[PDB]
C-alpha cells in the first residue's frame, strides 16, 4: 500500500555484440580514463543518447518556441556547468555534436589526474576509492 | 428477498445476462400489505435509514373529502366495488390506492344539513342568517345527491394503505363519477 519506490537503469548495451571496431574503440577509452567495465562507457553513451534525443526534438519546433527556449537553454546551462560544452559553441547544434570523450574528461578520477595529484589514471582511481 | 434489480431480466436485444454479484439489500422488495376491511390492525416496517412505513393489514375507517364542499370527514368504509387493476381486489374487498369504495354518507349528511339547513334527497337566529347567506350554492348535484338515500357514497381511495397505514379518499364527482357509474352498471 506504500507508494512505489521508483528506479531506472542507467546504461545501454551495443546492438551488434562483436563489432571488432567498437571493441577497440571501447577498450582504448577504458584504457585512457582508467575504467573497469565496458559498462562505464555504455552508461555514458546512453546518457549521451537521450541528451541528443532531447536536442533533436527541440530543433524540430521552430526557433523561439517557449519549450525550446526553456528546455533548450536549460540543457545548455547545465552542460556548461560541469564542463562538457564549450562556452562559445553554446547553442545546442553542438550539444548535438558532443562525443563521449567530452563527458569522460570531466570525471573526478580524471580531474584528480589532470592536475598531477596522482600521475597515471589508475593511481587516481585508487586514491579516490581510498578516502 | 424480492429484488428490484434489472440485472435479472433479459436485455432489450433479448440477450441473457450472467449473474453478476449476489443480491444486495438496497435493491430489496417486500411483500404486499393486501389490506382488508375490518377492525384496525397496523404493523410498522423498518425501512432504509431509520424510518418507517406503516403496513395496514386491516382498516375500517378512513378520512374522505368532498372536494367541492371544501370539507373532509372520517367515515366507516363500507366496501370495495370497483378496481381497475384487478377484479379480485373488489371480490376480496382489498384496499389499495385507486380502488373504488363506498363509505357512509351520514357524516357528510350531518354536516350538509347542518351547514345549508336543507336536507338531502326526497330555527336558530344566526343559523337562519347563515343558511340564507348560503344559497345558489346548495344545489348539490343529481348523481351525488341521489347517493345519500342508500346512505352510501362512492369515493376513490387516494392514499397508499400498505405504505402509511391510512386509507384516504375523495367522494366521486362530476365527470369522474360518471365514468365509474357507467362501469358499475354496464357490468351489472
Amino acid at each position: 500500500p506504500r507508494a512505489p519506490r521508483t528506479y531506472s537503469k542507467t546504461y545501454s548495451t551495443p546492438k551488434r555484440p562483436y563489432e571488432s571496431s567498437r571493441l577497440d574503440a571501447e577498450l582504448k577509452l577504458a584504457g585512457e580514463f582508467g575504467l573497469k567495465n565496458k559498462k562505464e562507457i555504455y552508461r555514458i553513451s546512453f546518457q549521451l543518447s537521450k541528451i541528443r534525443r532531447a536536442a533533436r526534438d527541440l530543433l524540430t519546433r521552430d526557433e523561439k518556441d517557449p519549450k525550446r527556449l526553456f528546455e533548450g537553454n536549460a540543457l545548455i546551462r547545465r552542460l556548461v556547468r560541469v564542463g562538457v560544452l564549450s562556452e562559445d559553441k553554446k547553442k545546442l547544434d553542438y550539444v548535438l555534436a558532443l562525443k563521449v570523450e567530452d563527458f569522460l574528461e570531466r570525471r573526478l578520477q580524471t580531474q584528480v589526474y589532470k592536475l598531477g595529484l596522482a600521475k597515471s589514471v589508475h593511481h587516481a582511481r585508487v586514491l579516490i576509492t581510498q578516502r | 428477498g424480492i429484488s428490484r434489480d434489472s440485472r435479472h431480466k433479459r436485455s432489450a436485444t433479448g440477450a441473457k445476462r450472467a449473474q453478476f454479484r449476489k443480491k444486495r439489500k438496497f435493491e430489496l422488495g417486500r411483500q404486499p400489505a393486501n389490506t382488508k376491511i375490518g377492525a384496525k390492525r397496523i404493523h410498522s416496517v423498518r425501512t432504509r435509514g431509520g424510518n418507517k412505513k406503516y403496513r395496514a393489514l386491516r382498516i375500517e375507517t378512513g378520512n374522505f373529502s368532498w372536494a367541492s364542499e371544501g370539507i373532509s370527514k372520517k367515515t366507516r368504509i363500507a366496501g370495495v366495488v370497483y378496481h381497475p387493476s384487478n377484479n379480485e381486489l373488489v371480490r376480496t374487498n382489498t384496499l389499495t390506492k385507486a380502488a373504488i369504495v363506498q363509505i357512509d354518507a351520514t357524516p357528510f349528511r350531518q354536516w350538509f344539513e347542518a351547514h345549508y339547513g336543507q336536507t338531502l334527497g326526497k330555527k336558530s337566529k344566526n343559523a337562519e342568517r347563515k343558511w340564507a347567506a348560503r344559497a345558489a350554492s346548495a344545489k348539490i348535484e343529481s348523481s351525488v345527491e341521489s347517493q345519500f338515500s342508500a346512505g352510501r357514497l362512492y369515493a376513490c381511495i387516494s392514499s397508499r394503505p400498505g405504505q402509511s397505514g391510512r386509507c384516504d379518499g375523495y367522494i366521486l364527482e362530476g365527470e369522474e363519477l360518471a365514468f365509474y357509474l357507467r362501469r358499475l352498471t354496464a357490468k351489472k
Binding site: - | 367541492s68 381497475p84 350554492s137 344545489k139 348535484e141
Partner: protein, 155 residues
C-alpha cells in the same frame, strides 16, 4: 399515439390535482394544465388544445427534461405512444486513421402532441427512466412528412 376516446382505460384518466368544481357551471369542461419544458422548445398548441391525458408528456405531464438533448431519425412507430430512433454516427478507428459507419437505436416516448411518421428527424430530451428501455422524450419535430403529398396521382 393515443387517437380517440381518451377514457379508454379501466381507471378514469385525469391530470393529477386539476380539479373541476361541478358546482361552477363552466365552458371548457375540464381545466387543463401545461408548462413549457424550457431550453427554448415551444410547447406545441396540440398539447394545450388537446384533451389527451399522458403522464409522460413533457408539456402536459409529470416528467422533466434535463440532460442530453439528442436528435435522431425515426425508424419505427409500431409502439403505442413511444418510438425508436436511430442515431447514426461515424467512429474513428485510429491505426487505419479513418472511420466506419455505426449506429444505435434509442427508444423514446412520444406525446400525442406530435404526429410522427417514419423518416422524421426528431429532437428528444433526457428523462427520468420512463419504462424499461425508454430514457428520452420527443420534444420537437425538426421535420414534417418528407414531401409525401408531392407524390400523388396523374395529370
Amino acid at each position: 399515439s393515443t387517437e380517440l376516446t381518451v377514457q379508454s382505460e379501466r381507471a378514469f384518466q385525469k391530470q393529477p390535482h386539476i380539479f373541476n368544481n361541478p358546482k361552477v357551471k363552466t365552458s371548457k369542461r375540464t381545466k387543463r394544465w401545461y408548462k413549457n419544458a424550457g431550453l427554448g422548445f415551444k410547447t406545441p398548441k396540440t398539447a394545450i388544445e388537446g384533451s389527451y391525458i399522458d403522464k409522460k408528456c413533457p408539456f402536459t405531464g409529470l416528467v422533466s427534461i434535463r440532460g442530453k438533448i439528442l436528435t435522431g431519425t425515426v425508424v419505427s412507430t409500431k409502439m403505442h405512444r413511444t418510438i425508436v430512433i436511430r442515431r447514426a454516427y461515424l467512429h474513428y478507428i485510429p491505426k487505419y486513421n479513418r472511420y466506419e459507419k455505426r449506429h444505435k437505436n434509442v427508444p423514446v416516448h412520444v406525446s400525442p402532441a406530435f404526429r410522427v411518421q417514419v423518416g422524421d428527424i426528431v429532437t428528444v430530451g433526457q428523462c427520468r427512466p420512463i419504462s424499461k428501455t425508454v430514457r428520452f422524450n420527443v420534444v420537437k419535430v425538426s421535420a414534417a412528412a418528407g414531401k409525401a403529398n408531392k407524390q400523388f396521382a396523374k395529370f
